[PDB]
Write a sequence for this structure.
């Protein structure tokens, strides 16, 4: 499995539709309003703001606090590497009662279930979950209630080194001497070992 | 053992250091340059005697 935030966001979006979809608004296709941040298509088209309440998913960054390389192994003749990653994600609810919805979303991510569905879709484990503020932003006319939350994930990624190769034959030479630097060696041992 | 017979009365022994032996000796597996010394005891076989007599 390779690590790609584009897939983690999609998996989280698909999971949230079932986990917390009953509290959200629904579009013309009856689907709950969960979307990825900064919507756009065809390199210039821009999405419209859905009907409230809705959810936004945005991946912040990715780091490797756990060393630099976790494993190096051979799976088939191609060499492989494994690396441990950490990915903080930001989920926000916009509308009225955003805090009341974020609280229930928090209380469900900690269940034994749900954490299995997340791993089934994204193949990642939930590591931490931060606090929830209760924000108000003026916009125009009326304030909008919002409630962000940060959910950190952990995943292992594997890549293939197509430039690598393996050793399958070894040739060894040796000598024996009574004294250091004895120019004609007392004995010479030549060895050759094949994998087969 | 010889000193126990009262044949000798002392001795000394000298041996080379391993970090000093030549390579030919090591190839031939032979140790050289060992030396020693001793001292003899002696005995008595004859006697010489002189005396005097008077009142």
């Amino acid at each position: 499995m390779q690590l790609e935030t584009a897939e983690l966001e999609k998996g989280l979006v698909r999971t949230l539709v079932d986990v917390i979809g009953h509290r959200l608004a629904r579009d013309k296709n009856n689907r709950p309003n969960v979307i990825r941040a900064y919507p756009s298509d065809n390199s210039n088209d821009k999405g419209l703001k859905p009907d409230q309440p809705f959810i936004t998913v945005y991946c912040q960054d990715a780091a490797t606090p756990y060393g630099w390389v976790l494993d190096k192994f051979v799976e088939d003749d191609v060499v492989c590497y494994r690396i441990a990653f950490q990915i903080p994600v930001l989920i926000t609810v916009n509308g009225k009662g955003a805090h009341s919805i974020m609280l229930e979303l928090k209380q469900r991510l900690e269940m034994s279930s749900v954490r299995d569905l997340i791993l089934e879709e994204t193949g990642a484990t939930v590591l931490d979950t931060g606090a929830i503020p209760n924000d108000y932003t003026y916009l125009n006319t009326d304030f909008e209630n919002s409630a962000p939350l940060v959910v950190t994930l952990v995943k292992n990624s594997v890549l293939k080194d197509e430039r690598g190769s393996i050793i399958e034959r070894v040739i060894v030479d040796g000598e024996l001497v009574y004294e250091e630097g004895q120019e004609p060696p007392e004995y010479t041992i030549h060895l050759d070992v094949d994998s087969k | 053992r010889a000193v126990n017979r009262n044949f000798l009365s002392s001795y000394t022994v000298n041996v080379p250091k391993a970090s000093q032996v030549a390579l030919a000796d090591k190839k031939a597996r032979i140790l050289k340059d060992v030396t020693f010394a001793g001292i003899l005891a002696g005995a008595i076989l004859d006697v010489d005697l002189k005396g005097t007599v008077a009142y």
